[PDB]
Amino acid sequence: RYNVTAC
């Protein structure tokens, strides 16, 4: 939920 692409 932290500017990471949807894991």
Add this chain to the structure above:
Amino acid sequence: ESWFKKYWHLSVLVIAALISVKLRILNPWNSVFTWTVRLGGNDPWYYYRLIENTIHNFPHRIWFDPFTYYPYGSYTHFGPFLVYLGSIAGIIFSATSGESLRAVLAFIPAIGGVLAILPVYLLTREVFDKRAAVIAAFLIAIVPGQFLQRSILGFNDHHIWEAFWQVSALGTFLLAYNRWKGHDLSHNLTARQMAYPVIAGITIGLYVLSWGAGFIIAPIILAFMFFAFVLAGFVNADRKNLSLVAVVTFAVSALIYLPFAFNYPGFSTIFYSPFQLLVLLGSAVIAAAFYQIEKWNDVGFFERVGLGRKGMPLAVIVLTALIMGLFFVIPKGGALTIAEVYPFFFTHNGEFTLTNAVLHFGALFFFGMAGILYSAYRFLKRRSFPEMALLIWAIAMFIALWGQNRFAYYFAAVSAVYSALALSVVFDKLHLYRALENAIGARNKLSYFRVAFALLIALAAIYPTYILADAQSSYAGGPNKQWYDALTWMRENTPDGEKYDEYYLQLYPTPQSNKEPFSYPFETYGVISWWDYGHWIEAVAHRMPIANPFQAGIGNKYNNVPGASSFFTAENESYAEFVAEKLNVKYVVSDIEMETCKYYAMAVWAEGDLPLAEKYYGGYFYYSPTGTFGYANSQWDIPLNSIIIPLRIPSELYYSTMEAKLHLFDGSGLSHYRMIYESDYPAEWKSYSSQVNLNNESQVLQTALYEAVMRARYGVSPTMGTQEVLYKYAYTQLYEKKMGIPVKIAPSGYVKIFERVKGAVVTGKVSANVTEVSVNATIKTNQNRTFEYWQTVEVKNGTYTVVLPYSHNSDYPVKPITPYHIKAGNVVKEITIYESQVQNGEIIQLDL
């Protein structure tokens, strides 16, 4: 009776502050302070870079960073507030770089979350009662979700100070309205009263000095003036002093923002440009404009003209249609695969659900809605202005929340302030306040039966809220050991180490545009990867990433823009080298996440549409109740009652892409990229290695199919390490007719690093009767994992030409164990290639 007369509201503040310290510092302590101080997410790592740079050149900081987005460079929209605050904090505690500096920054967001109790108390104390202020101040200390997760130790991002100063501004401004209203006989100033709108301007100032788009608070306050004026026939307020505290607050804030207002040539709503300086100065003029409309309305300007007090709002309608009528005079969900943004109150498949509102606010969302609803009718009858103004801010934060996930931290204060109202009402009418009054003092006429339900309501609003925040705060959320150990290795074993460390700290000029490749003061090279790891590669490995979390360096394939999406989704090496050379890359860093769950985002980014990325994936594994492995290309070939592994096995197009040729094939089948580093296996397969050896097939395949099924019984998919084995197993079956690189089905390292190499161009003549030449060499990685490199070239004009990337005396820990076994028909040789021919691309002759 002796201490709890004034210190009752202050002890519970200390209690609320102590629960905040437990959730934000104590819960995630063993996850932040591990092998290294683990700054979570991706943003707090770039702040680590800017603060480390600002301490270098103190008291002044950069505004353009050519160290990221390697070919051109990116501007910095990260506010100077947190950059300076973390820089002053880093120098007082004598921590200027490394883990020392990060350890100090870990406390910045946690402290901000604890201090956030004050403005929450302040804001709702001035619109409502001190009782509800105590509740809201307590409620904001345990509200979970994105407000909590970004207030956690080791997450120094601007989001906590974003809602901090945003609520601090509304409180100080409304406080400036209360200390000023009725006071107009020059007492409006008195060299004391001035400090209430002044401190409101410093809050708005520090709000914009921490977030670029912080100027959005100005239309919100201007909306207060708008509705306070147009509703003269329904709401009462001191429109004169309300306009004074507005023009003073806006002018002071604009005076504080003016220093940093020229760090971006041209207007921009995010970057620190003179645009935000015009909004704050302009809002002051509109505020002073409202002042003279009210001064005219005092003399009956709209009554001596024949208009009527029913028609005074039209004067505002006119003026607020001119300034907004003369201001101009002087949808693609594919590019938004990020987790921060997506339609709130809506499923990722598109369906209304409140599970988002529960997971980010607990019970405070539903107690807040009941609070907003009562505050609407409480204003609809009392006609109090600051209750209406607070509603406007509540609606504003709900509009922003309704569309974008990211703004869940802006609504935590909305829910906490309004759940406190809903709680303060049920505590007054259920005699819980009388009970707290009389069980300590003199007895009143109450009912213990109503008091019991009053605590039962409090539990329904506090237990689910805390039980979520308690569990959501037991982790950091940064780079794992496999990524940190892989990036610190790059800082040490890649060339130009000291040159990058020196340019990492230099103050960079502010260019007029970054369309041009930057003029680098030395021999630079680029490290390409997915943009999620751009801030990690820069702040840890101290290299230059083409793709960064600034939404830059991605490129695409539908327009042939060189980037990370066009590179990793390239289908051949020819198009791969194109984007590679255009961006001056040198190293690639692919992990197990790019190979599996993150490839769909890369496929969409390069295609610029979702249905175009559907061609990269195929069917699913089903397991019939009869216990048989199966692959159904569609969803109607699936046998009935058969359990489905919730993993989208890719199609044949993915298996011949760049990301697959890198991490899935361990660099085999390539001619210009050799593996130089491989991190340890994923954590789930490292614990599986204690009982199962990873080199034999049908043994690792057995334990992999067991983990997939025993987890597919629930609605979850197999782990990332298990996702790799299924991708390798489906390769030996769906790509069986081809098998360009027959790979062992086995897990690999979590993070791998390759090097773009010219290659030993080996050519020669062949026996003119065979049409291909194959080369092979067993290669050993730094994890002692063995694999076989392969490459096959055609025979043209009776000659051949191979480009071998790997070398036999490399300084990198990944190098072959056996010489190159070349073969053409039946003649074979045993040749060894050393680094002098590999790096320089030397020409070698060898007939067969």
